[PDB]
């Protein structure tokens, strides 16, 4: 059953590399982790505030590095996205991270920037709910949160997806992407999306008018070797007001996919709505039939 | 000497084009009537009334008009009708040789048009950051509109500024920049900001919460040789809601300017408010005390 958590072996490091956390949401999160018998390590600066950021870059870097020093940690679950994790990229000690035993980094939204950087450096990661999702359709939300422990245990390996137009085909490549806006906002920097040839580019977003999505897509595709992608795979675009625009969002995305001669898929249950099922970031997967399979 | 509301004659013909967002018919008509009141001979691009979603026609249609503005021998300025979104889309197909072959005809606009201003500067073509032509068809506003003809005629040479941070010595370099969001959205692409060493980076924006401004600023500065800039000079940040954020906008921009060790000025009367005085894009200027001069 998909609301059922798997035990998480070892300990989960909780860090806040992006936006600041409300105290009551943090405590509610920890109580839910305890319900589920999850042993955790709370980063020492998770309650820090520096404007809307979870502390200074230096504070966030200390917590992320500490998460990689402890030997019993088997996963690093980001508490909140929002904005700010790209700021850490010029300070990360990548060598200290490759040397630690495997511990997938977990999150979505702004955390997409760190997922991509991790993939570039050969480190495991998971695109899924941030841990404060625990402390906030309700059935779908609960299945999404449960999906993290289930993926860490290796017991889920597929999601449903639909091919939009085109023709029947099989696409195999690395799973990359996440939040369109966050990733576009790293183009031209050291944190630009890692997009090896053949990759399946997953995109989702929230809270944007269509012209801002198009602008972001144009930038992202112009900044990578787009024509060498295997596929573009849309998750959800939630709370994105159409405002009388003549073309649907799928028409716009379809025009871009056609321009680069890459197939377009959609309805992956991934993003900012109730459906946000975890998927392994940077692994080889296959688009076949009605699913994405790893 | 003349009042800032007093236009100068524009000799020859002004090409009106719409390389970004679509144009409302009534606003266009009022624009043309104001040009006629001022004795300005104009030519409307064949596709300026095109619509393709929110864009002023397809890429091919807009390229046809832009190219035509450089093919016609009697055109002495190219005044963009509206910004909004879309002119970066023209960069892949733009024939620079065709533009460079034509007699001098400054490109005028702001907002999204900043993207084209920068590309023109990279190709040694004259340009002006100031009101788009539809601003005519909608006292400080009138002075802003008059400043275009006055700058084409070469009679205005300075704008007021105020020092905000960093060293107080004279800065001399090329005037670059414009809209922060639009320029950040070209980072990592063929249309990225042309930012030669020593430049004075002007920035303005509208309608953004502070975290989005910071995200754009971090991207733009990380994507250029920021440390080699001469200065950052802020225009207006119009309708940018603070919403309880603990740090002021001046504090945030101060922190970034300090991080790259570049002096920071503000209160340039340039942007999306009533104060949008024209300045020469890509021209060498001097920033000293309470003035920017060229």
Curated annotation (Swiss-Prot), chain A:
The keyword Transport does not apply. Its main location: cytoplasm. Keywords: Carboxypeptidase, Cell shape, Cell wall biogenesis/degradation, Cytoplasm, Hydrolase, Peptidoglycan synthesis, Protease, Serine protease. Pathway: Cell wall biogenesis; peptidoglycan recycling. InterPro entries: Carboxypeptidase_A_C_sf, Class_I_gatase-like, LdcA_N, Peptidase_S66_N, Peptidase_S66C, S66_fam. It catalyses: N-acetyl-D-glucosaminyl-N-acetylmuramoyl-L-alanyl-meso-2,6-diaminoheptanedioyl-D-alanine + H2O = N-acetyl-D-glucosaminyl-N-acetylmuramoyl-L-alanyl-meso-2,6-diaminoheptanedioate + D-alanine. One of its GO terms (biological process) is peptidoglycan biosynthetic process. Its EC number is 3.4.17.13. It comes from the Bacteria. It is an enzyme of class 3 (hydrolase). One of its GO terms (cellular component) is cytosol. It is found in: Cytoplasm. GO terms for molecular function: muramoyltetrapeptide carboxypeptidase activity; serine-type peptidase activity. CDD domains: Peptidase_S66. The active site is at residues 109, 204, 272. Releases the terminal D-alanine residue from the cytoplasmic disaccharide-tetrapeptide GlcNAc-MurNAc-L-Ala-gamma-D-Glu-meso-Dap-D-Ala, which is a murein turnover product. Probably also act on free tetrapetide. May be involved in murein recycling. Belongs to the peptidase S66 family. Homodimer. This is Murein tetrapeptide carboxypeptidase. It comes from Pseudomonas aeruginosa (strain ATCC 15692 / DSM 22644 / CIP 104116 / JCM 14847 / LMG 12228 / 1C / PRS 101 / PAO1).
């Amino acid at each position: 059953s998909d609301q059922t958590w798997q035990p998480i072996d070892g300990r989960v490091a909780l860090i806040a590399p992006a936006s600041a956390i409300a105290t009551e949401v943090l405590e509610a999160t920890l109580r839910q982790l305890e319900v589920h018998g999850v042993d955790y390590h709370l980063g020492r600066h998770v309650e820090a505030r520096y404007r809307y950021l979870a502390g200074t870059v230096e504070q966030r870097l200390e917590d992320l590095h500490n998460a990689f020093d402890m030997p019993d940690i088997t996963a690093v679950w980001c508490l909140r996205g929002g904005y700010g994790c790209g700021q850490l990229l010029p300070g990360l000690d990548w060598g200290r991270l490759e040397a630690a035993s495997p511990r997938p980094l977990i999150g979505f939204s702004d955390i997409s920037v760190l997922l991509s950087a991790f993939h570039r450096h050969g480190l495991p990661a998971i695109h899924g709910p941030v841990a404060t999702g625990l402390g906030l359709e309700q059935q779908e939300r609960l299945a999404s949160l449960a999906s993290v422990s289930r993926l860490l245990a290796g017991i889920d390996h597929e999601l449903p997806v639909q091919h939009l137009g085109g023709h029947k085909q099989r696409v195999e490549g690395a799973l990359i992407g996440g939040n369109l806006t966050a990733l576009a906002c790293m183009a031209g920097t050291l944190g630009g999306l890692h997009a090896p040839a053949g990759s399946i580019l997953v995109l989702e977003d929230v809270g944007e008018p269509y012209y801002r999505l198009e602008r972001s897509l144009w930038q992202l595709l112009e900044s990578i070797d787009a024509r060498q992608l295997g596929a573009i795979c849309l998750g959800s675009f939630t709370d994105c007001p159409r405002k009388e625009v003549a073309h649907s969002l799928e028409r716009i995305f379809g025009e871009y996919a056609a321009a680069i001669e890459v197939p377009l898929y959609h309805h992956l249950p991934s993003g900012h709505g109730a459906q946000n099922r975890a998927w392994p970031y940077g692994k080889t997967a296959v688009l076949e039939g009605n699913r994405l399979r790893w």
